Amino acid sequence: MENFTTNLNQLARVGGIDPLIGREKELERAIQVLCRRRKNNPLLVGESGVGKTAIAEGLAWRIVQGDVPEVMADCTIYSLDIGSLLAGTKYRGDFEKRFKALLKQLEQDTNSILFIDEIHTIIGAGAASGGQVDAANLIKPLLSSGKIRVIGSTTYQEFSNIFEKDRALARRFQKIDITEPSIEETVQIINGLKPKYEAHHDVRYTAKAVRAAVELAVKYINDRHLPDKAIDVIDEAGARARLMPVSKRKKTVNVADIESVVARIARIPEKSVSQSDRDTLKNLGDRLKMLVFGQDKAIEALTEAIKMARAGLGHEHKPVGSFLFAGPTGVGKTEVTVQLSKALGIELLRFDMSEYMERHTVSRLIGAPPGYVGFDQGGLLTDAVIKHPHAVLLLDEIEKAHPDVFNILLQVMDNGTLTDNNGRKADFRNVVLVMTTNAGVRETERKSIGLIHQDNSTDAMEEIKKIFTPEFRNRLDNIIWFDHLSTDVIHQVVDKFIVELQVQLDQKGVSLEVSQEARNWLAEKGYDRAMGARPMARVIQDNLKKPLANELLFGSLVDGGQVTVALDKEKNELTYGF
Amino acid sequence: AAVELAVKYINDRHLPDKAIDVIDEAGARARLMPVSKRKKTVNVADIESVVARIARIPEKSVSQSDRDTLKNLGDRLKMLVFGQDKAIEALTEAIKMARAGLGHEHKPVGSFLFAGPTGVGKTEVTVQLSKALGIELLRFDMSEYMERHTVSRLIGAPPGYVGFDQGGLLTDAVIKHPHAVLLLDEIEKAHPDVFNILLQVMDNGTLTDNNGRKADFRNVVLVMTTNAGVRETERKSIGLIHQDNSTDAMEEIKKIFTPEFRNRLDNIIWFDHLSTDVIHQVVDKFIVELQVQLDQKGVSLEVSQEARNWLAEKGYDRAMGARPMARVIQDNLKKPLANELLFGSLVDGGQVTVALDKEKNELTYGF
Amino acid sequence: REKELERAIQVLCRRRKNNPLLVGESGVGKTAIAEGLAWRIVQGDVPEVMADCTIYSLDIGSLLAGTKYRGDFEKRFKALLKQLEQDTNSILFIDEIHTIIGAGAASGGQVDAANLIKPLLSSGKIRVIGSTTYQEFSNIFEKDRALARRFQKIDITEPSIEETVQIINGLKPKYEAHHDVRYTAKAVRAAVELAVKYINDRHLPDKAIDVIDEAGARARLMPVSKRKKTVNVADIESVVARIARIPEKSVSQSDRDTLKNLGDRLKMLVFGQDKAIEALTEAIKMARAGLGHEHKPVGSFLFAGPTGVGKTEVTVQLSKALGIELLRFDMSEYMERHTVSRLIGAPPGYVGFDQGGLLTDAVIKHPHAVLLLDEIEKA
Numbered sequence A: 001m002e003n004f005t006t007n008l009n010q011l012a013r014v015g016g017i018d019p020l021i022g023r024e025k026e027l028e029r030a031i032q033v034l035c036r037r038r039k040n041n042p043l044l045v046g047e048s049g050v051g052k053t054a055i056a057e058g059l060a061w062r063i064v065q066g067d068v069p070e071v072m073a074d075c076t077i078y079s080l081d082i083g084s085l086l087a088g089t090k091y092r093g094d095f096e097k098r099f100k101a102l103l104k105q106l107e108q109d110t111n112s113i114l115f116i117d118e119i120h121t122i123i124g125a126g127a128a129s130g131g132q133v134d135a136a137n138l139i140k141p142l143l144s145s146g147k148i149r150v151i152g153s154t155t156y157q158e159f160s161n162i163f164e165k166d167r168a169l170a171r172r173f174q175k176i177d178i179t180e181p182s183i184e185e186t187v188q189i190i191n192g193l194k195p196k197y198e199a200h201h202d203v204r205y206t207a208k209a210v211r212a213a214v215e216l217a218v219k220y221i222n223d224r225h226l227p228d229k230a231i232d233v234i235d236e237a238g239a240r241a242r243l244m245p246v247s248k249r250k251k252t253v254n255v256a257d258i259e260s261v262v263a264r265i266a267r268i269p270e271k272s273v274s275q276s277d278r279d280t281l282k283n284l285g286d287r288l289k290m291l292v293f294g295q296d297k298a299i300e301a302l303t304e305a306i307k308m309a310r311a312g313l314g315h316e317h318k319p320v321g322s323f324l325f326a327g328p329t330g331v332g333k334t335e336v337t338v339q340l341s342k343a344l345g346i347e348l349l350r351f352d353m354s355e356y357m358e359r360h361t362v363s364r365l366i367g368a369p370p371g372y373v374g375f376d377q378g379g380l381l382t383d384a385v386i387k388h389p390h391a392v393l394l395l396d397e398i399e400k401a402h403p404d405v406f407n408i409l410l411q412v413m414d415n416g417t418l419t420d421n422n423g424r425k426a427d428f429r430n431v432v433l434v435m436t437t438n439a440g441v442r443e444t445e446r447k448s449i450g451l452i453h454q455d456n457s458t459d460a461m462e463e464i465k466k467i468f469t470p471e472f473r474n475r476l477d478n479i480i481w482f483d484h485l486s487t488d489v490i491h492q493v494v495d496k497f498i499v500e501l502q503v504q505l506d507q508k509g510v511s512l513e514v515s516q517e518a519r520n521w522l523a524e525k526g527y528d529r530a531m532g533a534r535p536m537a538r539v540i541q542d543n544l545k546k547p548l549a550n551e552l553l554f555g556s557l558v559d560g561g562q563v564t565v566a567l568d569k570e571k572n573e574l575t576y577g578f
Numbered sequence B: 001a002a003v004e005l006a007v008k009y010i011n012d013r014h015l016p017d018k019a020i021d022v023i024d025e026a027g028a029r030a031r032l033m034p035v036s037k038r039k040k041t042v043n044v045a046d047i048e049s050v051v052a053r054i055a056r057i058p059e060k061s062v063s064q065s066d067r068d069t070l071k072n073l074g075d076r077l078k079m080l081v082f083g084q085d086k087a088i089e090a091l092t093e094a095i096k097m098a099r100a101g102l103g104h105e106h107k108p109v110g111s112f113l114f115a116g117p118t119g120v121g122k123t124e125v126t127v128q129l130s131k132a133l134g135i136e137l138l139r140f141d142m143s144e145y146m147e148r149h150t151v152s153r154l155i156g157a158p159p160g161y162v163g164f165d166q167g168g169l170l171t172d173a174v175i176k177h178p179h180a181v182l183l184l185d186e187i188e189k190a191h192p193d194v195f196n197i198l199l200q201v202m203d204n205g206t207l208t209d210n211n212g213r214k215a216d217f218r219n220v221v222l223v224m225t226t227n228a229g230v231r232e233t234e235r236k237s238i239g240l241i242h243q244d245n246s247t248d249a250m251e252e253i254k255k256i257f258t259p260e261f262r263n264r265l266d267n268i269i270w271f272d273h274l275s276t277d278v279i280h281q282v283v284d285k286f287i288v289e290l291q292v293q294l295d296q297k298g299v300s301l302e303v304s305q306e307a308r309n310w311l312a313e314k315g316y317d318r319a320m321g322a323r324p325m326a327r328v329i330q331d332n333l334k335k336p337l338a339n340e341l342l343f344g345s346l347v348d349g350g351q352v353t354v355a356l357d358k359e360k361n362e363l364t365y366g367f
Numbered sequence C: 001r002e003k004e005l006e007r008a009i010q011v012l013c014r015r016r017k018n019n020p021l022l023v024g025e026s027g028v029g030k031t032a033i034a035e036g037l038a039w040r041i042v043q044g045d046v047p048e049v050m051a052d053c054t055i056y057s058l059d060i061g062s063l064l065a066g067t068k069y070r071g072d073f074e075k076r077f078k079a080l081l082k083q084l085e086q087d088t089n090s091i092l093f094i095d096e097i098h099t100i101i102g103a104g105a106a107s108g109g110q111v112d113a114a115n116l117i118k119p120l121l122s123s124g125k126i127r128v129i130g131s132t133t134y135q136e137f138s139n140i141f142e143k144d145r146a147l148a149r150r151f152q153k154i155d156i157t158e159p160s161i162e163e164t165v166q167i168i169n170g171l172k173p174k175y176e177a178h179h180d181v182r183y184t185a186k187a188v189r190a191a192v193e194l195a196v197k198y199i200n201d202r203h204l205p206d207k208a209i210d211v212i213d214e215a216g217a218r219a220r221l222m223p224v225s226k227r228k229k230t231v232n233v234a235d236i237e238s239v240v241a242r243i244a245r246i247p248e249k250s251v252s253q254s255d256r257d258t259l260k261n262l263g264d265r266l267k268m269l270v271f272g273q274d275k276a277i278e279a280l281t282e283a284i285k286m287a288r289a290g291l292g293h294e295h296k297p298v299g300s301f302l303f304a305g306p307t308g309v310g311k312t313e314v315t316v317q318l319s320k321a322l323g324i325e326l327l328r329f330d331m332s333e334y335m336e337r338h339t340v341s342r343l344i345g346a347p348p349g350y351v352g353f354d355q356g357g358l359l360t361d362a363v364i365k366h367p368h369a370v371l372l373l374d375e376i377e378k379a
């Protein structure tokens, strides 16, 4: 035992193991179990990071501090490192001699408790031959006879998958469920532990820093439990603050440092909103109007959703915003979204919904159910939002997906979550959801029969309503109708496309000038309300790019020249040059 | 009592030692009593306390603060969910019976199907119930169980398969939290094979997982929500008089959930549409949420009564429930505030006054 | 990678569970950073807190190698940890840290490297820097919750274009030394820009570097015939083009005439329908000229008409004339809605999941190709 276990009273008394705060009921049972006539061995079972070891060792602390029932007073708790019982072995029989020697020592002390953490690891030692499991074979009678007292500890999952197969062991200890504290209990736990962080990091925490670490961690960090989750924030903020005095920036850790740390851990930005990001955001609405012409209202809706979220007036558990972009083809429905993600500097997660035409294609978004082929793959959607929690999520031509696929978004739009096939949750609260569609267009573009042409603008009233179930629609922030582009827009579109052409040419060392007459001509020639801005690229392709490709490819316009294009008036034909 | 209670509440061990353990812990417990110098014998009440602790169930509520918490549970919920009183009452009645002891031998605390128009707090009330009671909410978006084979994610892969150690997500959630509110959202979206899992739960309080262990739902409140019948509810009839289609919505529910399912529910509660009175309450609720969000930035907010009356009058839509009201709040209050909070006077300001004129019915703003 | 290290240091500086885990896509510099810190410590490019501390890199294979008998592994494992605990100013670094979870427990037991490490991380006794990909982190580290709680995940993203150029400028001298080459400024900038435009299934820090290394390696085989030269933008372009399959610079050579005469080689084979020939010929020329569509296909043209008029023959002849692969897809075989899974594959969990997807594999194998969809109206 001398070099296999740790005397926890000795440790708790001299170095300290950090105080245990609260957990009155947890200890009440542990003691009542330890006080039983037989099988007086509690097992602390729970979610990782809830204080299972904190309690098991915390008991040693209470004993050395005298804060125990006299029954427990003066008893010694020893923690066993089973790794050391194997490190000292090699051939047959040495393990058992060593293992039993420790048991004899516990029996001889008579007033001691052994603590075995990771209790599910006591299964082992036997190998090659085996059948002698250690875990049960060397201790079943020790536990059932009351000769020794053992406190164990385990993760709830390990407990059911491993620590629960051996019924004989399952029967020999009393399980105590350690659940995670609530907000207040977490705050008091921090206050009790706080002096150790302040002492370790040479920092001090404000009342708000502590209050906030708990509330913020709960809201933003969701893969850990409260008592160790809020601590990471406090400890991390401490470690960060400790790196300031290096430039003499000695300071108290305040709520501002906590928010910076939570924001970094959760990858959700929070303080830059007060800095230059105010202008990046302020100007967002206009940068996008230089890329998508017309459609200002779509730009505003996106811009507004983002501003509210950055302002802090977002929702508590919804995507940044979620609206469907409907309209005629070639009007900037996907273009504004692509540009939004560029303007914001964030990842664009683009899915083509045309690929999800069968009901069973949902498995590509979620992953196969356990037990199936594609299980370890995970889901493509849930994974995309996990790697990039701050993103623009674009679902192109959503009306092409099998309609049951839309059901996947009900919980996304409403709770910001989606659960993958491993049970992990996607978190969409920092994702802008944009879905585009051509629903209703075929109808809006149809001519009616009669003397008076009917106004078919109520496409929203039929196709959008028939396609998207009421519960889907009632979760959208908006349904935004993109219009056909006007001729004023076409002129802007043509200018835009010519610039794109100029850039491709600049990269080849040549440049292009187009006269205004030539531009107006191309705009006038290509406009077709029905196809939006889509054909303008073809008009440019035929009137400017084809001529240029011949000049670029066969030597007429290569190194040494530039091309000027002008329109004549007689034929309205374009000129070219060098 | 140790013997007859252990067989009812402790189900992972055989009786000899299972009952002795109750006796032994009760013994140890009583042994730790005369430290206060109060000598004890072990009565039925001490046995019941031990079983309650071993089985992870509630003991006796009348002398507890739980008595008061339970007594006015309906009142607190009515402050969060307006209207739909009958749903609130059904939930609290089932709970009271269970704590009263007038429960079921082997069934969930109660089992309800929440049906009705959208935007009505079918989900909202369940979420608040778990908060009001202080217990874990176990959620399961049923839209994610659309294929016959998705059942294995609820109960785990069969042994020997790639998803065998993961276990089931449902049985594990229940095992970890035996006393909980279990919410199954949009249950009608799940593949019907899923309902077969629910039928046995509703009748026995239990599911066997892929490890052969059982989840005990005896202390779980089971609420599942649905939109079955909504498209029909919102349909307008042909004629001069619009018809009440709630009767057809039920026909839709009865086609999705077969008699075998329906007979295992304690109730099917058809939630009604929200009234204008409710909207006024809803608007105040949303404004308060806004005020809280603003307080977090150090900004106070006043909204006049007329501004409230107007927002409520503007946003009400009987068919869409309360969800649109939040849209009204975003456009009339949050957007203006975001600009002031982000680029203007409220950054280090801290105050905003909102009222409207009568001539334009436009809102005021500013520090 | 200043911020990536700032966080790593802040994690190492924590009181407990001060073990950063570097998680990211492959080829993004995760291990470059962990080794980079050892480099910075030695060079004095780190806070005094890290200064003078030793980072050791663990060979899991040598730790497990030879551990026969019951107890040798456990002994070696513990000896290592003891040595680290007695150093007091060291950090252990583990590549592919998810593999520690698979350390050899001898038999049916659970005593292995992860179970033996856990208490020393919780206690703050030792410091470990881990490294794993987002996929290995998800399928391995994410599952062992207790171990995962002892690491602080650092999210390492792919660098920008400007950042990639800068790492090349820093790394460059070693490629120059290794290959006996020198790289021009244009060569470096282009490796990054071109790799971004043309090389898929890789991340920048690696993608640009791979081009620099190969181009250096190409030039390394020139002064064997004493064709000594530097690596210019043209050489970088050639290397990327090897992968991209359509060079932007060779278009200026004999390729100009191969392309110029394309229209006539096709007119002599397909008669009438000159307009189809022109449509195809022009699309290619623009694409080779550089007047492409940035992200769209070379061109997409529906050929409609009476039978026996050369609609598929001209496309077949095009692929022949160009010297490129013809990918054929008979649309009549996709006569039903569900037949789409033949083109892209079955969803995960379904029979045939690992069979592939005919269209996506055809295109992936042959990036430069003519894709012909016969009788599209029959799909």
Ligand SMILES: Nc1ncnc2c1ncn2[C@@H]1O[C@H](COP(=O)(O)OP(=O)(O)OP(=O)(O)O)[C@@H](O)[C@H]1O
Pocket: A018, A019, A020, A021, A022, A023, A047, A048, A049, A050, A051, A052, A053, A054, A055, A058, A155, A189, A227, A228, A229, A231, C145, C146, C147, C149
């Ligand atoms: N009363 C408490 N005493 C000590 N620690 C507590 C307490 N309550 C919560 N904690 C938190 O839990 C941790 C205490 O250590 P503990 O051994 O209990 O972890 P754990 O719950 O067993 O997690 P794991 O399964 O990974 O070992 C600390 O992060 C601490 O912030």
Ligand SMILES: Nc1ncnc2c1ncn2[C@@H]1O[C@H](COP(=O)(O)OP(=O)(O)OP(=O)(O)O)[C@@H](O)[C@H]1O
Pocket: A291, A292, A293, A294, A295, A328, A329, A330, A331, A332, A333, A334, A335, A336, A436, A438, A485, A489, A492, A493, A496, A532, A533, A534, A537
């Ligand atoms: N308002 C606009 N300003 C400038 N260019 C535009 C505009 N609208 C469309 N375009 C042009 O069309 C493209 C933008 O993509 P767009 O949003 O129109 O796709 P879409 O609306 O989804 O149509 P589809 O039905 O084919 O998917 C760009 O090439 C862009 O030059």
Ligand SMILES: Nc1ncnc2c1ncn2[C@@H]1O[C@H](COP(=O)(O)OP(=O)(O)OP(=O)(O)O)[C@@H](O)[C@H]1O
Pocket: A471, A474, B080, B081, B082, B083, B084, B117, B118, B119, B120, B121, B122, B123, B124, B125, B225, B226, B227, B278, B281, B282, B285, B321, B322, B323
């Ligand atoms: N009776 C109510 N009182 C106040 N707010 C309500 C009420 N009912 C609904 N709401 C509003 O709805 C919001 C939550 O939506 P809810 O949970 O009710 O949708 P649902 O019941 O699931 O219906 P569906 O999903 O079919 O659209 C609440 O935050 C609340 O603002």
Ligand SMILES: Nc1ncnc2c1ncn2[C@@H]1O[C@H](COP(=O)(O)OP(=O)(O)OP(=O)(O)O)[C@@H](O)[C@H]1O
Pocket: C269, C270, C271, C272, C273, C306, C307, C308, C309, C310, C311, C312, C313, C314
């Ligand atoms: N314009 C042409 N000039 C010379 N030969 C030709 C022409 N068209 C077709 N042919 C010949 O006739 C045969 C059929 O040609 P092809 O398959 O390309 O026509 P198609 O448009 O595909 O008809 P289908 O409607 O059946 O698909 C080929 O062997 C081809 O050599």
